[PDB]
């Protein structure tokens, strides 16, 4: 009830999103991307082209901070430096909070650290009235850590080696976002998947369907032409 309809559109710097889906504050756009198709790389493109629209919405939106958050659940050596070097290329590095996780950093904290970080979002986004962009990327490595408890313990695998408490595990994460009716801050969260192949019966494409309204897919067909 405290959520109220999203409508304040931003520039993501691809005409394609700001027309067909027309991404707005408080909204989620999962970027469906199979395996063998990059999405960390190409996401940095959106991440640096992101900029509010204040002259078309009738009021300032640069007047209240546009900070951004990033957070990996598990990444390599090259993609570590690649990220910072694409934030250093525009100086979009400034005013960011990065709660990175790596593949050699605890395997238990791939699924703990998202939940933590999102409650540090609520403080600067809602209670200091900032427009916070959350971008959570590498959501398989999530699922790796999820798997571990799923079956080894008392919990049972209710679909594909992941617990049957799966529903909750994807609820507290995803639910964070939506325009407030009494705050003027928002949490706009944009999950970017690396879901397995082009499968739709796999847990990731599953629930994500129902949840979002707006969603976009990237495919490998035009990706070998070299169009981005």
């Amino acid at each position: 009830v405290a959520r109220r309809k999203p409508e304040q559109f931003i520039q993501t710097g691809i005409s394609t999103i700001d027309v067909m889906n027309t991404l707005v504050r408080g909204q989620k756009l999962p970027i469906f991307s199979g395996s063998g198709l990059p999405a960390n790389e190409i996401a940095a493109q959106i991440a640096r082209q992101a900029t509010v629209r204040p002259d078309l919405s009738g009021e300032g939106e640069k007047e209240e901070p546009f900070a951004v958050v990033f957070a990996a659940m598990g990444i390599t050596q090259r993609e570590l430096s690649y990220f910072i070097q694409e934030f250093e290329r525009t100086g979009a590095l400034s005013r960011s909070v990065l709660f990175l996780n790596k593949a050699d950093d605890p395997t238990i904290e791939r699924i703990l650290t998202p939940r933590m970080a999102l409650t540090v979002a609520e403080y600067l986004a809602f209670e200091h009235d900032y427009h916070v962009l959350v971008i959570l990327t590498d959501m398989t490595n999530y699922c790796e850590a999820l798997r571990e408890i799923g079956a080894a313990r008392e919990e049972i695998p209710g679909r594909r080696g992941y617990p049957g408490y799966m529903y909750t595990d994807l609820a507290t994460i995803y639910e964070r976002a939506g325009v407030v009716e009494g705050k003027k801050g928002s949490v706009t969260q944009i999950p970017i998947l690396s879901m397995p192949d082009d499968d739709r019966t796999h847990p990731i494409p599953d629930l994500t369907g129902y949840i979002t309204e707006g969603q976009i897919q990237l495919s490998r067909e035009l990706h070998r032409k070299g169009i981005y």
């Binding site: 199979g34 395996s35 063998g36 192949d197 082009d198 499968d199 739709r200 019966t201 490998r220």
Partner: protein, 53 residues
């Protein structure tokens, strides 16, 4: 790489057969009609031809 679903798709691959198996049944005596009557025109062709040549 790229691979299709395996329980959504289950329903479509059973129906693959209904379209396929029945589909090719009728494909057989279809083309046979046109090729059957064709022969008639090839034979009958040389009728006037030989005469008037």
């Amino acid at each position: 790489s790229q691979v299709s679903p395996t329980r959504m798709n289950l329903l479509q691959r059973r129906g693959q057969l209904r379209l396929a198996q029945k589909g090719v049944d009728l494909l057989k005596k279809k083309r046979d009609a046109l090729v059957a009557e064709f022969f008639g025109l090839v034979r009958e062709a040389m009728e006037a031809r030989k005469a008037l040549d």
